[PDB]
Structures are given as structure tokens and as C-alpha cells.
Write a protein that binds this ligand. Structure first.
Ligand SMILES: C[C@H](CCC(=O)NCCC[N+](C)(C)CCCS(=O)(=O)[O-])[C@H]1CC[C@H]2[C@@H]3[C@H](O)C[C@@H]4C[C@H](O)CC[C@]4(C)[C@H]3C[C@H](O)[C@]12C
Ligand SMILES: C[C@H](CCC(=O)NCCC[N+](C)(C)CCCS(=O)(=O)[O-])[C@H]1CC[C@H]2[C@@H]3[C@H](O)C[C@@H]4C[C@H](O)CC[C@]4(C)[C@H]3C[C@H](O)[C@]12C
Ligand SMILES: C[C@H](CCC(=O)NCCC[N+](C)(C)CCCS(=O)(=O)[O-])[C@H]1CC[C@H]2[C@@H]3[C@H](O)C[C@@H]4C[C@H](O)CC[C@]4(C)[C@H]3C[C@H](O)[C@]12C
Ligand SMILES: C[C@H](CCC(=O)NCCC[N+](C)(C)CCCS(=O)(=O)[O-])[C@H]1CC[C@H]2[C@@H]3[C@H](O)C[C@@H]4C[C@H](O)CC[C@]4(C)[C@H]3C[C@H](O)[C@]12C
Ligand SMILES: C[C@H](CCC(=O)NCCC[N+](C)(C)CCCS(=O)(=O)[O-])[C@H]1CC[C@H]2[C@@H]3[C@H](O)C[C@@H]4C[C@H](O)CC[C@]4(C)[C@H]3C[C@H](O)[C@]12C
Ligand SMILES: C[C@H](CCC(=O)NCCC[N+](C)(C)CCCS(=O)(=O)[O-])[C@H]1CC[C@H]2[C@@H]3[C@H](O)C[C@@H]4C[C@H](O)CC[C@]4(C)[C@H]3C[C@H](O)[C@]12C
Ligand SMILES: C[C@H](CCC(=O)NCCC[N+](C)(C)CCCS(=O)(=O)[O-])[C@H]1CC[C@H]2[C@@H]3[C@H](O)C[C@@H]4C[C@H](O)CC[C@]4(C)[C@H]3C[C@H](O)[C@]12C
Ligand SMILES: C[C@H](CCC(=O)NCCC[N+](C)(C)CCCS(=O)(=O)[O-])[C@H]1CC[C@H]2[C@@H]3[C@H](O)C[C@@H]4C[C@H](O)CC[C@]4(C)[C@H]3C[C@H](O)[C@]12C
Lengths: 238, 238
């Protein structure tokens, strides 16, 4: 266990860098200061784009990640994006109840996901991840370290050097325990409690891929506001 | 962290109780001392039955499990059987190479699984679990504690008291760390390395359910030996 090879402060920085601005959260949910038009395709493409940025800007800021062969960096991001995205929108949603806050600042309510056909996956996110993170008062350093552990997956298919990725993973969890021990001495089993949210992240990630949850999650509100305009507009042709 | 509420010795006992006898391994693979006939249905039903016994006899021997409401005991076994079964046949296969040893003592070779249509799931078992367990020289106490952590899943749907199951889970991993620390002081990050095999167990378990891997794994050899007899028998009707 050591913090020099994997500083938790440098891991917290990576998480803070990609954190949405307060103005993003406010604008999205008030419909204010739109850059974007009421076109569903544009809005979906912009949301996907903002999510990709969050994952890539975060990863590059993780210690030693950019020292891996570029081929391995692509494989790790492509193999873990689903889980990385889920862990990120789960922790961001701790303050909110019955909903998810996306990288665009948008709040997707439980009800919208239930009418969208993704209700059960959404409830698994709320229950298995969001509630659990809120109860332990999981901090952004802990999230950061959980996400770097997901990132540094030595089991990803196609890696040139799996031993390097595995050595990088070990350092993250060695720093995570040192951090947990020093900040939460009253909680001796917190490190395990954190690592034990990863199997749920794994199953949820697979279930999201099978149901087009990412597509429906980012596509639902843009479809609603577009239809709202058409329904609110006056009578048309013939 | 404490061993009185969850003794690792009592957890090792549970694993040892359900461990196949040497005579089972020898008889299965030599075709010797058959109780069973060359009927595929009987052989599949007997294998499923032996696997169920292993899971139930193991669980009852786990400290405090039988003190949970009986309704919760059923839910925990039904929710985690797939993962419990996989962790069990993975560790049993450490000594063998390119194959899996079942509770019936039977050795299913990689090649048979490839011709059966389950090749990729089988290779994931060999690579993600079997190899990893063999490299760390994972002991039966460690396996036992990993399996009780899977057993005591507080996220299972329908539990009357999820807090009790979660409290039981915490004790297992508290004992597991104390064990790891005391037996492997040269390996300070072993406890994490062990807990980090659980997300792979989770994904593999889901993939096994979607491809009828348990059905095909136990059904393949009984179908082969039945067809072998028919093909080896002399010419028949008209
Ligand atoms: C005070 C808090 C945040 C605290 C903070 O962190 N403050 C840094 C500077 C805040 N901003 C980044 C928004 C400045 C934008 C300058 S920009 O050049 O980008 O327009 C900010 C964040 C978003 C702001 C609201 C939204 O805007 C929507 C709306 C626009 C109207 O018109 C005026 C009213 C209203 C309700 C705003 C009030 C207030 O002010 C809010 C709540
Ligand atoms: C801000 C206003 C609501 C104001 C309001 O009506 N506020 C008082 C409520 C108080 N109550 C009567 C409930 C009593 C509370 C008692 S209690 O004790 O329970 O607190 C709400 C009502 C309809 C909302 C829009 C639509 O959705 C469509 C769209 C969805 C997107 O996603 C975000 C953008 C957008 C344009 C939304 C923006 C905004 O969000 C609107 C204007
Ligand atoms: C565009 C309309 C406003 C009504 C309208 O139809 N107004 C005319 C066009 C306005 N424009 C600014 C595009 C003009 C540009 C001219 S220019 O020549 O500069 O291109 C506004 C009002 C509510 C806005 C949505 C919500 O917030 C929720 C959500 C937040 C995400 O974060 C981005 C996606 C999404 C779906 C938002 C999209 C868009 O933002 C909406 C539909
Ligand atoms: C109909 C409601 C106002 C009614 C109200 O009081 N909202 C309180 C919340 C309670 N509900 C949502 C249940 C009310 C439903 C309608 S009810 O008839 O029940 O009141 C108003 C308030 C804000 C309005 C949107 C924004 O301008 C942005 C955007 C501009 C585009 O150019 C056209 C589309 C869009 C999405 C607009 C649609 C619609 O025009 C909204 C939702
Ligand atoms: C010495 C080792 C295991 C060491 C051990 O743990 N020894 C405890 C007693 C062993 N058994 C449980 C098998 C006794 C069965 C008594 S029973 O009443 O169940 O038949 C035992 C385990 C299984 C035994 C083989 C198989 O049988 C198949 C075969 C049957 C023939 O005929 C004789 C040859 C052969 C190759 C056997 C030789 C030997 O002996 C083996 C390898
Ligand atoms: C024990 C004998 C093989 C003996 C043998 O032929 N032994 C010498 C090999 C030495 N070599 C020539 C390979 C050189 C090694 C050089 S090296 O340097 O590589 O070591 C093998 C050959 C065919 C096998 C059966 C069938 O499968 C069907 C069935 C499958 C079930 O699942 C288990 C039961 C059963 C009845 C099997 C039992 C047993 O298992 C048999 C009789
Ligand atoms: C039954 C045949 C032997 C040839 C035959 O067809 N022999 C006549 C019948 C013999 N019986 C003992 C059933 C008579 C009982 C009379 S009584 O009146 O008592 O019912 C034997 C030889 C090889 C044996 C398989 C392999 O090992 C692999 C595997 C191990 C598992 O662990 C159990 C399943 C499986 C598929 C085994 C089933 C069965 O075991 C086989 C086919
Ligand atoms: C054909 C082979 C022997 C040939 C040999 O030398 N085995 C070495 C291994 C190498 N191979 C598997 C590639 C050889 C394939 C056949 S080859 O023609 O290439 O030799 C022999 C050896 C043991 C025999 C089984 C047992 O009695 C149990 C059982 C009794 C039932 O009543 C009928 C079914 C069954 C499954 C029997 C089938 C078959 O009769 C086996 C596999």
C-alpha cells in the first residue's frame, strides 16, 4: 500500500475536471440559455458527445493511463465505457431523489424512464448504486478510485500487456485502502464495502447494453420537447 | 474486523464437507463403478441433483445462514446459485488444465465445450477465474469466504430483512481480511485481489444463464456416451 505511484489527489483532480458546471444543471432543467435547437437528432448527438468527453478527459488525467500503449488505452475505454458512465451518473445523482443527472446537466425523472420502457434498469441504478453511495456518503476520491479500478481492467480482450494494466489496478486499490484507513478510521470495512459495489455495476452495465438504456436515457427528453412543440403549435395542412 | 462472529475455520468446514471424494473423480473419468446407466436424461438429472446438494449442504454449514428467515434463505440460494456453482467448479479445476471438474467428478475438456457451442463462455471461465485462482494459489478458506460474500447478497429482490444479510456479508469480509493479513503478510493487497474476481463471476454467471451453459455442460458427455454405444452396437432393422 502506497500513494506516491498512484496519488488519490491526482485521481480527485480527474473527477473534478469533468464535473458539470452549476450553470449547466440550472440551464438544462429550466430550458434556459439553449445553444441547442428543438431537434431530437442534434440533442441525442450532443448528449452522446458530452458523455464521451467526460470519459476521455477523465481517463487522460488518471496517473500512468497515458503511459500505456495507445492500442491498450482504446481497448480499456471501449471495454469499460458502460460501467464508467453508469458509476459517474450514479454518484452525481446522490443529491437528487427519484432521478438521474446526466453530463448535460439534464435531470431524467423515474416516471419518464418508466413510460420509456427502461423502468426496471432505472430502479436497479437507484437502489443498487445511487442509494448505497448516498448511505455511505461515498466521496469523489472514492468514486474516482472505483472508476480507475474499472478503467484498469486486466481481463479486457486484446490487451498487448495485461500485466501492466493489472499492476496499475493494484496501485489504485492500494492507494484507495490507505485513503479509506486515514480518512474513515471509524469504518474499518469501508474499503471492502466500496469494492463490493463493482459486481452490481458490472451486471447493470450488461443489462444497459441489452436494452438500449443509454440511447433511450439521452433520447427521451429531446423526443418529448420536440412532440410538445408540435402539439402546442396551431393546426396545419389541407 | 473479527473472527468470533464469522469463523473462517467453520467456513472451510462447509467447503470441505461438499468436496467430491477422490473415488468420484477416478470413477467418473475411467467410466468405472457406474451406479448410473447409459441413459442421457438420468445422467443430466443426477448431475443437476449432485450440484443442488453441494450448494444446499454448503450454505447450511455457513455460520448464521440458517438463522435467517427461511423465505430469505431460499431467495439468497435462488439468486446466487449460478455464481456459487461457477466459483465452486472454477477452484476445483485449478489442478487440471484445459478443462472443468464437476461435482460428479467428471472432467469436461475445452474441446468438448467448443464442439457443444459453449466455447467462448468456457474460455472466459478458464481465463478470468481458473487461471487467476491458480496464479494467486487461492486457498479453500478464501474460496469459502468469496462464496459466502456471494451468498449473503443484500441486493437480492424480495428479502424480508436486507440489513441482516448486509450485516452478515460485512462479517465475512471482515474475517476474510483478518485471515489474509495473518496468513499472507507478504501480500498486503491480496484481500482486494480476491474481492476483485467477483465482477467477473457476476458477468460470467449472467452469460451462463443466457446460453444454457449449465444444461449443455452437464448434458454433453451423457449425450456422447449414449450415441457412442448406438454407433458401436451392430446393424439393426428391416
Ligand atoms: C448563482 C448561481 C451559481 C453560483 C455560481 O457558481 N456563480 C458563478 C457565476 C454564475 N454563471 C456561471 C451562471 C454566470 C454566467 C455568465 S455568462 O456570460 O455565461 O452568461 C447561478 C447558476 C445559474 C444561475 C441562473 C441561470 O443562469 C438561469 C437564470 C438566468 C437569468 O438570466 C437570471 C436568473 C437565473 C435563474 C440564474 C440565477 C443565478 O445567477 C444562478 C442560479
Ligand atoms: C419550473 C416549472 C414548474 C414551476 C412550478 O409549478 N413550481 C411550483 C410547484 C409547487 N407545487 C404546486 C407543486 C406545490 C409544492 C408543495 S411541496 O410541499 O410538495 O413542495 C416547470 C413546469 C414545466 C417544466 C418544463 C417541462 O417539464 C418541459 C421541459 C422538461 C425538461 O426536462 C426541462 C425543461 C422543460 C422546458 C421544463 C422546465 C421547467 O422545469 C418547467 C417550466
Ligand atoms: C430550443 C428550445 C426553445 C424553444 C425554441 O424552439 N426556440 C427557437 C430556437 C432557439 N435557438 C437557441 C436554437 C436559436 C438559435 C439560432 S442560431 O442562428 O444561433 O443557430 C429549448 C427549450 C427547452 C430545451 C431542452 C431542455 O432544456 C431539456 C434538454 C437539456 C439539454 O441540455 C439539451 C437538450 C434538451 C432536450 C433541450 C433542447 C432545447 O435547447 C430546448 C428544446
Ligand atoms: C404547458 C406548460 C405550462 C403549464 C403549467 O402550468 N405547467 C406546470 C407543470 C404542470 N404540468 C406539466 C402538469 C402542466 C401541464 C399543462 S396544463 O394544461 O395541465 O397546465 C409549458 C411551460 C413551459 C413550456 C415549454 C417551454 O416554453 C419550452 C419549449 C418552448 C417551445 O417553443 C415549445 C415547447 C416547450 C417545451 C414548451 C412546452 C409547454 O408549452 C410548456 C411545458
Ligand atoms: C488409492 C486411491 C485413493 C486413495 C484413498 O483416498 N483411498 C481410500 C480408499 C479408496 N476407495 C474409496 C476407492 C475404496 C473403495 C471401497 S468400495 O467399497 O467403495 O468399493 C484410489 C481412489 C480410486 C481408486 C481406483 C478406482 O477405484 C478405479 C479402479 C478400480 C479397480 O477395481 C482397482 C484399480 C482402480 C484404478 C483403483 C485404484 C486405487 O485404489 C484408487 C486410485
Ligand atoms: C484411459 C483411456 C486412454 C488410455 C491411453 O491411451 N493412454 C495412453 C496415452 C499416451 N499417449 C499415446 C497419448 C502418449 C503420451 C505422451 S505425453 O508426453 O504427451 O504424455 C481412455 C480412452 C477413451 C476414454 C473413454 C472415452 O473418452 C469415453 C468416456 C469419456 C468420459 O468423459 C469418461 C469415460 C469414458 C468411457 C473414457 C474413459 C477413459 O478415459 C478412456 C477409455
Ligand atoms: C453405463 C455405462 C457402462 C456400459 C453399459 O451400458 N453397461 C450396462 C449397464 C450398467 N449398470 C451399472 C447401469 C447396470 C445396473 C443394473 S441395476 O439392476 O442395478 O440397475 C457407463 C460407462 C461410462 C459411463 C459414463 C462416464 O463415466 C462419464 C459420466 C460420469 C458421471 O459421473 C455419470 C454420467 C457419465 C455420462 C457416465 C454414465 C454411465 O455410468 C456410463 C455411460
Ligand atoms: C473406441 C474406444 C477404444 C479405442 C482407443 O484406442 N482409444 C484410445 C483413445 C483415442 N481415441 C478416442 C481417439 C480412439 C478412437 C477410436 S479408434 O478407432 O480411432 O481407435 C473405446 C474404449 C472405451 C470404450 C467405451 C467404454 O467401454 C464405456 C462404454 C461402454 C458401452 O457399452 C459402449 C459405449 C462406451 C462409452 C465405450 C465406447 C468405445 O467403444 C470406447 C470409448
Amino acid at each position: 500500500s502506497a500513494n506516491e505511484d498512484m496519488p488519490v489527489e491526482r485521481i480527485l483532480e480527474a473527477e473534478l475536471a469533468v464535473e458539470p458546471k452549476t450553470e449547466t444543471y440550472v440551464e438544462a432543467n429550466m430550458g434556459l440559455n439553449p445553444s441547442s435547437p428543438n431537434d431530437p437528432v442534434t440533442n441525442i448527438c450532443q448528449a452522446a458527445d458530452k458523455q464521451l468527453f467526460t470519459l476521455v478527459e477523465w481517463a487522460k488525467r488518471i496517473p500512468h493511463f497515458s503511459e500505456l500503449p495507445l492500442d491498450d488505452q482504446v481497448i480499456l475505454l471501449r471495454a469499460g465505457w458502460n460501467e464508467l458512465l453508469i458509476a459517474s451518473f450514479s454518484h452525481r445523482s446522490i443529491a437528487v431523489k427519484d432521478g438521474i443527472l446526466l453530463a448535460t446537466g439534464l435531470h431524467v425523472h423515474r416516471n419518464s424512464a418508466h413510460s420509456a420502457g427502461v423502468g426496471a434498469i432505472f430502479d436497479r441504478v437507484l437502489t443498487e448504486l445511487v442509494s448505497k453511495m448516498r448511505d455511505m456518503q461515498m466521496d469523489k476520491t472514492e468514486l474516482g478510485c472505483l472508476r480507475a479500478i474499472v478503467l484498469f481492467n486486466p481481463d479486457s480482450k486484446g490487451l498487448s500487456n495485461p500485466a501492466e494494466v493489472e499492476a496499475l489496478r493494484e496501485k489504485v486499490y492500494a492507494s484507495l485502502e490507505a485513503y479509506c484507513k486515514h480518512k474513515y478510521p471509524e469504518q474499518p470495512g469501508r474499503f471492502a464495502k466500496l469494492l463490493l459495489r463493482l459486481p452490481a455495476l458490472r451486471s447493470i452495465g450488461l443489462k444497459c447494453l441489452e436494452h438500449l438504456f443509454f440511447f433511450k436515457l439521452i433520447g427521451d427528453t429531446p423526443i418529448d420537447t420536440f412532440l410538445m412543440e408540435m402539439l402546442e403549435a396551431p393546426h396545419q395542412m389541407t
